Amino acid sequence: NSTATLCLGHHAVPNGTIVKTITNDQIEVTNATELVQNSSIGEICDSPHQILDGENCTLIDALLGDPQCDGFQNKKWDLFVERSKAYSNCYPYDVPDYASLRSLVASSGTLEFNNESFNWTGVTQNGTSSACIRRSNNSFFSRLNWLTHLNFKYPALNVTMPNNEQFDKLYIWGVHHPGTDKDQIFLYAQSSGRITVSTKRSQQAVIPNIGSRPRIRNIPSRISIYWTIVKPGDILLINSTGNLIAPRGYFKIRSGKSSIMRSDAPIGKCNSECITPNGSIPNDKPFQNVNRITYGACPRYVKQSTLKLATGMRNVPEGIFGAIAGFIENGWEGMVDGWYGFRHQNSEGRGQAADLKSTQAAIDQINGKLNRLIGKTNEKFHQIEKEFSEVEGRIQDLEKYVEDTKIDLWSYNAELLVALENQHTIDLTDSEMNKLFEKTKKQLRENAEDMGNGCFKIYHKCDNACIGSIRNGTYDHDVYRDEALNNRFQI
Amino acid sequence: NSTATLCLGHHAVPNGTIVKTITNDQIEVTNATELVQNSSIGEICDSPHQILDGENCTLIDALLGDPQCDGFQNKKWDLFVERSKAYSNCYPYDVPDYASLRSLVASSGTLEFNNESFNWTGVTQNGTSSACIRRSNNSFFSRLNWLTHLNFKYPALNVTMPNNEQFDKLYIWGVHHPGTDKDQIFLYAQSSGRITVSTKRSQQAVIPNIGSRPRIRNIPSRISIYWTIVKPGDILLINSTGNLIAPRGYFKIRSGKSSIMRSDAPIGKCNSECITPNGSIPNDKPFQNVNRITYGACPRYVKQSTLKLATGMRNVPEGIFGAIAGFIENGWEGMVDGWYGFRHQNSEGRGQAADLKSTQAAIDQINGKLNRLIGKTNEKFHQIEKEFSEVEGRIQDLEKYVEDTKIDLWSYNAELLVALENQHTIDLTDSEMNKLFEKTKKQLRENAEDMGNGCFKIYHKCDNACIGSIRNGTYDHDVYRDEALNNRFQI
Amino acid sequence: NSTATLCLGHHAVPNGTIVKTITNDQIEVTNATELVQNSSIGEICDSPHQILDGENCTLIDALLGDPQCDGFQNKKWDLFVERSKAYSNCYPYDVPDYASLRSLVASSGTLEFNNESFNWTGVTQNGTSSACIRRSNNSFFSRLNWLTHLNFKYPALNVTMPNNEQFDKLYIWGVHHPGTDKDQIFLYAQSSGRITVSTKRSQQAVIPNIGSRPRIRNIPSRISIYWTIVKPGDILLINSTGNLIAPRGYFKIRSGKSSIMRSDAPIGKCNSECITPNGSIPNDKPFQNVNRITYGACPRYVKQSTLKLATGMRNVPEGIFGAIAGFIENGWEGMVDGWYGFRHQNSEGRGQAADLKSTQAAIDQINGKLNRLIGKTNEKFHQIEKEFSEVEGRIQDLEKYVEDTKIDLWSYNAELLVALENQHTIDLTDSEMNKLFEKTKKQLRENAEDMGNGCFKIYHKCDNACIGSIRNGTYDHDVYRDEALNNRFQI
Numbered sequence A, B, C: 001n002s003t004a005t006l007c008l009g010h011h012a013v014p015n016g017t018i019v020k021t022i023t024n025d026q027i028e029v030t031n032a033t034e035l036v037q038n039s040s041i042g043e044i045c046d047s048p049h050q051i052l053d054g055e056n057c058t059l060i061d062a063l064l065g066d067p068q069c070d071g072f073q074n075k076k077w078d079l080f081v082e083r084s085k086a087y088s089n090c091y092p093y094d095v096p097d098y099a100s101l102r103s104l105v106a107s108s109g110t111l112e113f114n115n116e117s118f119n120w121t122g123v124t125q126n127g128t129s130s131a132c133i134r135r136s137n138n139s140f141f142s143r144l145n146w147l148t149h150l151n152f153k154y155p156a157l158n159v160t161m162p163n164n165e166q167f168d169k170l171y172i173w174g175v176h177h178p179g180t181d182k183d184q185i186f187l188y189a190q191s192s193g194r195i196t197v198s199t200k201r202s203q204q205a206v207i208p209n210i211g212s213r214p215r216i217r218n219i220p221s222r223i224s225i226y227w228t229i230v231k232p233g234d235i236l237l238i239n240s241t242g243n244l245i246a247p248r249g250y251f252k253i254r255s256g257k258s259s260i261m262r263s264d265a266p267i268g269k270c271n272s273e274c275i276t277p278n279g280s281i282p283n284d285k286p287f288q289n290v291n292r293i294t295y296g297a298c299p300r301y302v303k304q305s306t307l308k309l310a311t312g313m314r315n316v317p318e319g320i321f322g323a324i325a326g327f328i329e330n331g332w333e334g335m336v337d338g339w340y341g342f343r344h345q346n347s348e349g350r351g352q353a354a355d356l357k358s359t360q361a362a363i364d365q366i367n368g369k370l371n372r373l374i375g376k377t378n379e380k381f382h383q384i385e386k387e388f389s390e391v392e393g394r395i396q397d398l399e400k401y402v403e404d405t406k407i408d409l410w411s412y413n414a415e416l417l418v419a420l421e422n423q424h425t426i427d428l429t430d431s432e433m434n435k436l437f438e439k440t441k442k443q444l445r446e447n448a449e450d451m452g453n454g455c456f457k458i459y460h461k462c463d464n465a466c467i468g469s470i471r472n473g474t475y476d477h478d479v480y481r482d483e484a485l486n487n488r489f490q491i
């Protein structure tokens, strides 16, 4: 009562959160934040990326000109979205290395088509069919020109088209495989058939194959689709003695941030940077567990479903410096205006006051970590395919291995980051507590002794103004030293 | 002698181990554990994975039905093991994209075969040869049907088989390349030859090639092998005007954890989760240096041959807090019952006692690290090939680049992990020493002074019970304070 | 004046450097070092790697024997350098899977050619042309043998060459595609044409294709190039009924550290381990931002343009322990002979002296980090291509994805490394300051008090020798204790 008590302490909360550290699988901190995005809003937002809903059409079909896809002529996109309900409703076709054509078009991001006046003298043009109905009338692929005999003849062709432009030209064309020699003759006069299209730096030579294939919408014949790119100064040369499905011009081909994604998520009227096939996801967090397939500024895909980053000190209700959860027995739930503070007992009563500077010092360091982690995601656009409908073997093994390797390495980085950061956050908060204790100890000089539990026995009368002077660093120890020394060193 | 001495200290061992840290390439700790598995027991354990020793046969040969491999019919496996002594002893064949077929079968993990009744009217069946001897009699691939002319004719074929099942069908078939036009005629009547097998979504068209190839076991002709997968609702259509080696049915194809590995390690009767081509390896450690090729729950392959994780404090025989290898000059080899402790000298003699709580605190943190690192390996099954017998160029460059990239990134993670963990382990053990010293200092209050080497000069008579009271935290400093103050502050 | 003052402190500089840490985006340290190499000297040094400047020739052209490339016969290289000004000046040719052939030759690293005596009876040899002029005379590819009819006939060929050597043989050959049936007849008698070259383990069957292609230097015909590798015990068998461009022997094929790089950097007379297409770069730093394409012992490519590693303490002009930028208000710019030191004031004046041991302790730890980071780069030779002139789709997507994945993971490692190291460097330097303060405090025992700003009020007369005794650890506190106690505990 000719003394006072001044206790240093830290807050605590009733609702702590369990986090992982380097040394401990489960340690409770006052607060934490989730680093793995685990949910989607279920819609693909139409902003800020130019979305193109394929709806009933695949990219290839819109490219070829299946009547169902006429509304897609000359469209551009940042992301083309293919629905699984999609289906082709024209002449049956295949594409050798389909995936590569789909990819290069997707990545180009435009269906811009220019018509070119090819010299088809000696042949019938605009071939038409019952399996490809447009406006209730028999039609064909809008971008392709089906050549047939004219007056029962079909001469050799040797037509050229030069690229005298400042850009690349993308040609799409194909070969017809009739189901019967009857049809071969009926359509092309001759029995055989041969197609050869060349440039200065390439040649693709195709030999038709008459034969039966299982009928698709009642058609047993097939078209095989091919592409060739012609650069400025180069020339397209197309030779044919049969079966040639002719281009009507070229597609502009670009390089940019365009791509394509398989999804059945509906398009919504909203704005979100990151798109997955499950829908758009917020990109505030650095990691996500929604889908390895993403487009835009996205958190990185990891295996974990949750990773909590501590944003507060260890919670001790009721560190390397040994203050928090050490010589200070527990935290103060009644301290809600700061993280660290003072409790005192003197002649005028018992009080509690937060220390702002130590509180702010810890908060700033924690916000420093958050600043490095939150809202810093990176943009990816066209990548590789990561889900597959058919067995292909080698190349598919490689593609899957690459993505699995990547994911394990990112999942490792995420796990280690959080464990290291959390160990460090618990240590820095213990350190700020220790610094406050140490600073106060030095202030008191010979006027007080450390009771070993964060409390100082102050060996002189110390009213509220006196305690206040200690808390704001204006305590003059010389004023009380004589009083304190006599109380300390007596019998 | 009207005083006592109490010294704080830590153990040390005669046999220290050198580890790496962030700041030091070679620092000695009391104990460490090896994180890189560097040895195999030389055998592939037959448990707990279903092992299939190919012995004399490659997977493809067991698939085709080389008489040598009859015992393999309809077998399943988790891991198929190909021996290098393996060799084919039937009709000479090649497979275009051999590696992809080998892969998809390996990954499927079953040789389950169902026979199908194909309508081969107009042809001779069960063709047979001298290069493929079964039961001492001329035979052929058990799963293939060699068609030849019947009565010197060989009509067009147009046979269908539909998939009306709930699963995929895998068809294996092939084309015969006779060495002479003589043989072409002798076998198939006609001079030419043509094979076309189709589904609703595919077509593979093959044209035979008569010609001589260097004789393998005296045969200059060859079979080329092909495969096609037919899904539910789809149909196989096979057209042929020559040279068709016919399937006798389909293989069930599955998806699972199956794979294949090249090794000459004998199969042992033992249980081990992780298999390498050198033999099975323990998977307690997180890393391994045995082989980049693995199967099962395996440590990750890294380049280092050794990485030691400190599991004890710095060894100081004869840190950031400056206690261990700092103001405490050395450790105590005579302390074998704890890591940290007390030595005293008083009127009753000199003694040493371990402090359990500080010892346990360091041990728990170290076990926390071990828990994150030991026995936590991850399962990989079918991957990519990582050793190659032939030059292939581009794709092989990519496969090698991917694995080399992966390995360097894991080797980096391993190196950094151990350096960080070791720096931290040395620091946390120094910290526990410091906390014990600090706690003891506070206990003694004004009754003792810090001599600067971890020892306290206690300024009062302190018998064994008194020293004991300090060690178990029951020391009442008020009892001795008058005695201590008078001894401290005299002349 | 019956007292002295002894202040503990650390240096500071006028020219600090901003670095990143875990908790702070911008913190000033006394010194830092750059970890990202951002510049090239613009030349490719001809040492210590054997450089081969392709100059006007591509690797393939030197391989085939384009007259322009005669000087390259049988050359070896560590790194072949292709110039963009390069051009072919012989018979127009293409290579299917050009990139794979270029790669395997590059990786082999030799143009060693042995001539082989093939039995070409029944044919004319040494075919020659106007598009391939050597010594002012019509010539051909030096390594190829253009076969034509002899006396208007051209029999079937069935020539063998066996590998009875201890090494692999690499055969290069090709097929001629005449522009007219006229030329086909003129050159090869027959109308058709067929080439089939085989080994015991392979067969490549080619069918020529008569037709027009856009003329390259006035030639509309083309040669297609192929390769086959024959191992010891195996045999080359080449059948042909037309159009065969024959090999004149084989290339030795090796395995080693050879590769190829596209660059327009001039070759310089200098020595540098690391080569990029921009020129050689120093490899002292662990990372580089110059080019993802490298050869030799190179720093790793990362995205950042700069990463500064702190090599000094926090700069405080005018940490977890709270000494530097904590209870010590600022550093001393006037201390240029050490990092930590003593300032005193006594009867004889005011002085400053560096403490070497604490200075050396921090410097050693920092050099420990530098030793792990500086001059430890790793050797890579032949890798994958990373820049592309044509759209290819799938495989190119995979190659680009792999490199982009790798780069992001290394850029992550670099960013985290520096942030962790810097946080730790700032903390260890604060720790050394704290240890020095703590050690000094203990030395002084009851003779001094901590004023709270790193300074001790020493309560006795302490001349220069006395202060000196404190700095070199020979201070005997017992000598002054009576004097000090009386001054401390008075009124």
Ligand SMILES: *[C@@H]1O[C@H](CO)[C@@H](O[C@@H]2O[C@H](CO)[C@@H](O)[C@H](O)[C@H]2NC(C)=O)[C@H](O)[C@H]1NC(C)=O
Pocket: A212, A213, A214, A215, A220, B158, B159, B160, B235
């Ligand atoms: C080969 O066989 C298939 C199936 O038996 C034939 O295709 C069928 O043709 C009939 C008309 O005769 C159609 O009604 C069926 O719908 C077809 N089935 C399928 C699965 O496409 C085919 O015509 C035969 N080939 C030849 C040349 O006759």
Ligand SMILES: *[C@@H]1O[C@H](CO)[C@@H](O[C@@H]2O[C@H](CO)[C@@H](O)[C@H](O)[C@H]2NC(C)=O)[C@H](O)[C@H]1NC(C)=O
Pocket: B212, B213, B214, B215, B220, C158, C159, C160, C235
């Ligand atoms: C092409 O040449 C090869 C090798 O000279 C011939 O193959 C040989 O045929 C004889 C029989 O006449 C066998 O005894 C040899 O063992 C064969 N050698 C090899 C390497 O296979 C082949 O017959 C020739 N082609 C033709 C059509 O006669």
Ligand SMILES: *[C@@H]1O[C@H](CO)[C@@H](O[C@@H]2O[C@H](CO)[C@@H](O)[C@H](O)[C@H]2NC(C)=O)[C@H](O)[C@H]1NC(C)=O
Pocket: A158, A159, A160, A235, C212, C213, C214, C215, C220
């Ligand atoms: C196919 O057309 C091309 C271009 O019209 C022809 O190639 C030209 O041939 C003339 C000679 O008649 C040359 O002067 C031109 O330089 C050639 N142009 C190109 C682009 O190569 C080609 O001859 C035609 N095919 C046939 C069989 O006549």
Ligand SMILES: *[C@@H]1O[C@H](CO)[C@@H](O)[C@H](O)[C@H]1NC(C)=O
Pocket: A013, A015, A016, A017, A030, A031, A032
């Ligand atoms: C703890 O409770 C408070 C008050 O209800 C709340 O604001 C805070 O978010 C809670 N913390 C956690 C981690 O849920």
Ligand SMILES: *[C@@H]1O[C@H](CO)[C@@H](O)[C@H](O)[C@H]1NC(C)=O
Pocket: A031, A032, A033, A311, A370
């Ligand atoms: C928990 O931490 C996060 C991140 O700093 C913050 O947004 C949230 O407000 C905190 N919760 C409380 C109750 O302070």
Ligand SMILES: *[C@@H]1O[C@H](CO)[C@@H](O)[C@H](O)[C@H]1NC(C)=O
Pocket: A055, A056
């Ligand atoms: C898509 O096709 C379905 C039939 O499969 C049809 O009902 C629907 O109206 C089509 N949608 C559009 C936009 O054409």
Ligand SMILES: *[C@@H]1O[C@H](CO)[C@@H](O)[C@H](O)[C@H]1NC(C)=O
Pocket: A125, A126
């Ligand atoms: C074919 O149809 C297109 C438009 O559908 C037309 O521009 C073109 O002139 C037609 N060709 C012929 C030969 O009539």
Ligand SMILES: *[C@@H]1O[C@H](CO)[C@@H](O)[C@H](O)[C@H]1NC(C)=O
Pocket: A179, A180, A210, A211, A212, B156, B157, B158, B194, B239, B240, B241
């Ligand atoms: C393929 O089979 C059908 C039925 O005979 C028919 O297209 C034809 O006969 C066969 N192909 C050839 C090239 O003869």
Ligand SMILES: *[C@@H]1O[C@H](CO)[C@@H](O)[C@H](O)[C@H]1NC(C)=O
Pocket: A038, A039, A040, A277, A278, A289, A290, A291
């Ligand atoms: C996203 O879709 C995948 C299937 O493509 C599914 O496995 C995953 O659970 C989905 N995620 C969410 C959050 O719905």
Ligand SMILES: *[C@@H]1O[C@H](CO)[C@@H](O)[C@H](O)[C@H]1NC(C)=O
Pocket: A464, A465, A466, A468, A469, A470, A472, A473, A474
């Ligand atoms: C320090 O506390 C005393 C006591 O209440 C007060 O009078 C004084 O204004 C404070 N000083 C500062 C700088 O706030």
Ligand SMILES: *[C@@H]1O[C@H](CO)[C@@H](O)[C@H](O)[C@H]1NC(C)=O
Pocket: B013, B015, B016, B017, B030, B031, B032
């Ligand atoms: C040190 O020696 C003891 C006793 O022989 C032994 O148990 C221990 O394993 C040794 N430590 C090392 C790292 O070898």
Ligand SMILES: *[C@@H]1O[C@H](CO)[C@@H](O)[C@H](O)[C@H]1NC(C)=O
Pocket: B031, B032, B033, B311, B370
């Ligand atoms: C060394 O550490 C390992 C891991 O904690 C432990 O298994 C072993 O018993 C330790 N050795 C000694 C001698 O304590």
Ligand SMILES: *[C@@H]1O[C@H](CO)[C@@H](O)[C@H](O)[C@H]1NC(C)=O
Pocket: B055, B056
């Ligand atoms: C495997 O083949 C060798 C001959 O190459 C033979 O000696 C051995 O008995 C065969 N093993 C089996 C299991 O058939």
Ligand SMILES: *[C@@H]1O[C@H](CO)[C@@H](O)[C@H](O)[C@H]1NC(C)=O
Pocket: B125, B126
């Ligand atoms: C061919 O042999 C199999 C069994 O080896 C038999 O089931 C089949 O009936 C035979 N075919 C003919 C046409 O005899």
Ligand SMILES: *[C@@H]1O[C@H](CO)[C@@H](O)[C@H](O)[C@H]1NC(C)=O
Pocket: B179, B180, B210, B211, B212, C156, C157, C158, C194, C239, C240, C241
């Ligand atoms: C290939 O060479 C041999 C020997 O003459 C024979 O098979 C045939 O004559 C050649 N091929 C063709 C298609 O003529």
Ligand SMILES: *[C@@H]1O[C@H](CO)[C@@H](O)[C@H](O)[C@H]1NC(C)=O
Pocket: B038, B039, B040, B277, B278, B289, B290, B291
């Ligand atoms: C495992 O096999 C590889 C060769 O495939 C060899 O380089 C390596 O040394 C072997 N490891 C052991 C531990 O035997």
